[PDB]
Symmetry: D3
Subunit: 291 residues, 6 copies
């Protein structure tokens, strides 16, 4: 820990200066999911890292999901699911559970972890002050698209009140639930949502915390791994990717095409992954830029 | 509805003018519980009334409880309670349920009901931006006081960020959960809490929505009912009151002694009770002032 | 007064909520003339109504005339008039009298009536801080137009300083006198002027207080009366109207065509007419919209 | 006009610099009466001088009277006066005439004269936005004091809204009429009033435009004239002064004792007297300081 | 000094009022060189004149040169010059001397002279907060252009931070040294620079303090002197001017064509020349306007 | 450089978080002298470190000296010194040289080094906008105190305009020259000055860049070195210190007693010493706190 000469303790800090300039006064949207939210030691480091950005004058906006904890509460409550394709149909009953688990349990832990370093985080959904709206989403079941309930994409973002909040010195911890135009609340996929917030707010970077080292073009060839890719190439390769990392990837493309400078798929198993990806050239992840 | 001559439609409005002057630019804390939150028609009217205040330039702050809905989720989850006196011991397991039911279910309905009239409500607990803190509370079991878990009173209120919020045009819908000084979240009794917010913010009025016509000194003598009372008399009469209305009453006294001009115990069974109590001399409730 | 059940006292208030939302933060120009300014009881109610709007966060701007009081001072002073058509020629002598009666008598009563409810009203003419200018107006005598002295229409409005004033929480009570480009003060017809202010300021509504129930297309067929009309129809019907209500009508059309959402011709004999027309669907008057 | 070498045109300007520093950003109250308001050439110069101060960043506040023009309108109207001592009893009838002559005639000329140089002046009385209040004043008739109607001294000044106005770049032209606490408007002596405004606003200087060269201790010994005097000496000499200059003098003492640095009694017959007194050491007037 | 009747002391002041209106709230760039900076009495008057403008609410920006004092320090240091044409080649050694003489000696005197009247002046070069940049300049030696070292014209001006400074009440005293795009500091000709600042800031007037009465078209015919000229005529006459006044003239044309209303070539031997040129019609100088 | 595992690249950054919280939004005064200003590689790192603080939202204020460069210019100019004790008498001739070397050479390098990372630094002396004043200082020659010319201590600091500057996002690079009350400029010892600025501005930390590892109580016993000390002990030990480090030490005590939390004597030979001392527990220097 300290058997490390100082002369180079100084050097690692001093090589963060370019990215401190790059990110000073800018929005950085961080999608936070996977194991980064399961292990206590990683969780506290993630929190402390949000504190870090905010004591450098960067404006983080956290967007979290919560698949597994939702399904655990549904079984605990004995709510039998219905499944079309692999998707659970989101009934009014399911929606209310998703809402109370995402907003009243998962988001609360992150808010309390970040607020140990200061009065920074505040939790919100699209319902609070109409910050964002949803629009119902059908999924393609297998050729035919069909309805799987009250799920949707982010429809509109109140960019104004959002950047009021972070300029006021606050870290928004977002739960991806939103009203539609008639007031009916839908659950939104947190990867998609994070790309939609990042684009609305003119974020400098989208950070996608995933449980993989990075994007392998030829999974699992160890050296197929890639550290940077354009949108156009990533687009043509999208249909050849593993099931779970497809949402993290179209989020990246919809954001970078949407004008975000770069989207990053990083390893949420590395402790302090965001500090590594933002202020260090030794990034585990993969960068996505337009092209 | 309209078989009412207009010449007096005009008169009822014009007699709201004194209380519009009294309340323009001021904080009004409304504790919202009882049946006012059970019946849909009353609920929508309560929401529309919060919208009303806010389109007159009054600054409402809603504080809600949720006893019955909490205990319903505990039984649904099969969490066996422990009971000292009549109090349920609030385990870490119970606390997390209280939190997710108060913040992720009950507060969400009120936020969505108010936001049908505009981007006004935002939900918060004392955890968000450290708005308020708690301090653990023992209750007197029966002579001896003893511990009944993670319950406490409101400890400190960030008056500053709170009045920033309402001046920004927002209606805070508060869930009474708060960190203590070491970050551990307690459940706070929503009547107490509402008196503590009202005092911190320099509210003009505390409104206590209860399921009774008003305070009867000699329950149930029909004419023992009283429309106004001082603190000192109400204090001496406190030990002679029904079990459930004692918390609504010491909240009133701790607020009015605390410098709030008046606390009001009103009938949440009357539709639009807050509009009646605030802009009309035909108030069902009972007013509490210092003396 | 109070033999009116409360359950419906509550209902009349709660049905003002849509127009409180419609009018919150907006300009409402009220032309104030006729009997509304002759009877003390109506006058005090008009004042209290301006106070009302301002304690709901609406921004009233009052524009008053004063034909009869001017001619009374001219006779009291023994100033013999000259008359072309039915118009009095406005000499420098007449102008100074009009000015001192409109600004130093009539406007002063309204300012003092409104200021019994608070420091709200301030009187002004177009001369103060160059708020508006005039341009001399000839009238068509009977085929030929000819000069009838220092009378004119509103030329330019300093929209900026005007909306500074009402955002500063003030109710402007305007006397319709204005400099021309060379500094010479003209009298302006207060109906015209009110339409010109309303258009300049982006008012939500123009309210024209008149001494009639509303606009009768076939005066005096009792049922020719109409509650709403477009500009285009009202235009084609303008040449068929009574002598005194023509100015109230072209003011309405020049304002609504000018982009004001609606102009209203209301009964200033009804006590609290503006409260009835603004927050109630039982409006005596007639609404004018574009078409 | 120009047969004046420039080398000294430069010198007179450059010797205004100390008083530009002294007066930059400060309030200067100017009481404006006497011949300064009767002759057109002097009047225009007075106006242009107010424009001058305001284009140097000084904050002038003009306070005018109007004895003779009031009595002319009373005779024109055939209102017979009643006289106790030499004072006219101010009936409700007289008050309304005073008000309409001061505010609707006299103040209007000054506003239009100043506004030829820019949108600067705005007229006001104590009735507008409750800027100042009056309190009824009895005068000592001759030993015994008695009532002479609705006349009073300035009671309270809304210092706040007043300095809002001049910081907003406006020159207030004040008519000395004010409500009392029950809303009844009194006429206030414009010398007194000017001392009361100056003290309330923390004026740097009070300027009293009078029709005399200055204060002669032994009128009419030509060399009894004095250019500067303390309060205490001026106090002891007050009972030995001419009838008309006593009000100009107790105004001076009540202001300078009230904390205004200096009061000045200047010759309103000199063209541009205020420019001479403020930016030149060749002042005709007499300075009053505390002592 | 005072044997000058006051009645006309008043008149000279009152004839400054139009130019006080013209210049209130505007930028006036004054290039300050020649004898105006050599004689102590003229220097103090120049300073006091900058103080003057700033206590009238004008925003002066001073730009100074310093040819002779630079060459004196080079000889004092024994730095042998190299000369192409009549130009000294500006070596890194020469540049550092120019910088320390212009910024650390010449500008310091002016700052301390102006700050005797108040905390107004602040010295700056283009290096401070990157206020302006330079671009290297070759001069035409005699037909062929060639390099004469680190000299350049003003490249870009941070108009924003510049007008922040003067609105903050400060008088910038500029030394004409600026970084290029790679950070290398060049010396800039102070006449050119002053025209470049004036254009960037939207100055009302450029004042060029020169050691001549004005521009003589046929030097030295006494009556060839001219008080006003357009750009187009001045352009065609530029190749027929004396060696030293050519830079003062193309500065004038590049500024007035650049949109500055007028450039003025004035006599810095006249004491208080800027006060004479700005607030008096007896200007020694010559005005340049577009045409 | 990169043969350093990342897992601990992450760790060194994450251990800066406490001092980022401690220093966010605070003033840090850095005295910059010694070798830190002689070697190019150290100089650029010092600059980049000031950039660092400013892209974390810390407010650095640099105070530099320049003994050796002054004496070099005096010899280059052939100015013979006069010496009382070991002190050079500071003649008007010497002062002007000190001023032009400190402000026009030394401060210019630091400004240009910092401005390679952004428009941040601005140079100033106490002469600019009267930011600080001096008061002449005699030194005790050897028992008797005597005059050694225009040298003094910092007299008063305009705290207001100073913190305006850094909140405006600027890094002040201060040259220690200041006017006295009569406008005469003195040279101030840059260690003293830095303690005086730090106290005036409520700095969080004073950083004293020195050419020693730290304070040795028993120089040169290698282990007499100390990492933290109180004021009271340091006071009693002051008379037993080496000649050159006495000024760095009484600056520390006058600042910490003056209410600065801590003063630090650090090794300006270590590259990036300020980054090490501020964001790392491996500090070479010695901390001074009150006691
Ligand atoms: C626009 O929304 C807000 O301002 C907001 C929402 C939730 C909060 O906890 C807080 I503090 C502010
Ligand atoms: C732009 O005009 C004004 O601001 C104004 C005019 C009259 C007043 O009585 C007041 I207070 C403000
Ligand atoms: C943009 O530059 C400045 O704000 C500035 C520069 C130098 C100063 O002495 C001062 I005070 C402000």
């Amino acid at each position: 820990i300290e058997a490390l000469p100082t002369h180079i303790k100084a050097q690692v800090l001093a090589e963060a200066l370019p990215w401190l300039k790059q990110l000073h006064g800018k929005v950085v949207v961080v999608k936070y999911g996977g194991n980064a939210m399961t292990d206590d030691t990683l969780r506290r480091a993630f929190a402390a890292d949000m504190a870090f950005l905010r004591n450098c004058g960067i404006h983080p906006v956290v967007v979290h999901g919560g698949g597994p904890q939702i399904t655990a509460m549904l079984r605990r409550l004995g709510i039998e699911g219905d499944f079309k394709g692999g998707f659970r149909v989101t009934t009014p009953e399911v929606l209310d559970v998703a809402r109370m688990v995402l907003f009243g349990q998962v988001g609360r832990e992150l808010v309390n972890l970040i607020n140990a370093h200061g009065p920074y985080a505040v939790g919100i959904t699209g319902e609070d002050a109409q910050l964002f709206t949803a629009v119902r989403r059908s999924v393609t079941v297998d050729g035919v698209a069909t309805d799987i309930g009250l799920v949707g994409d982010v429809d509109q973002v109140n960019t104004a009140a959002m950047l009021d909040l972070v300029a006021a010195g606050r870290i928004p911890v977002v739960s991806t639930l939103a009203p539609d135009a008639d007031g009916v609340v839908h659950n939104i996929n947190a990867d998609t949502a994070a790309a939609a917030v990042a684009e609305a707010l003119g974020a400098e970077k989208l950070l996608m915390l995933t449980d993989i080292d990075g994007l392998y073009t030829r999974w699992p060839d160890r050296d197929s791994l890639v550290s940077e890719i354009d949108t156009g190439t990533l687009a043509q390769l999208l249909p050849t990717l593993e099931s779970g990392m497809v949402p993290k990837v179209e989020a990246c493309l919809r954001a970078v095409i949407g004008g975000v400078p770069s989207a990053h798929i990083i390893d949420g198993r590395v402790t302090h992954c965001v500090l590594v990806e933002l202020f260090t050239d030794a990034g585990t992840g993969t960068k996505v830029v337009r092209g």
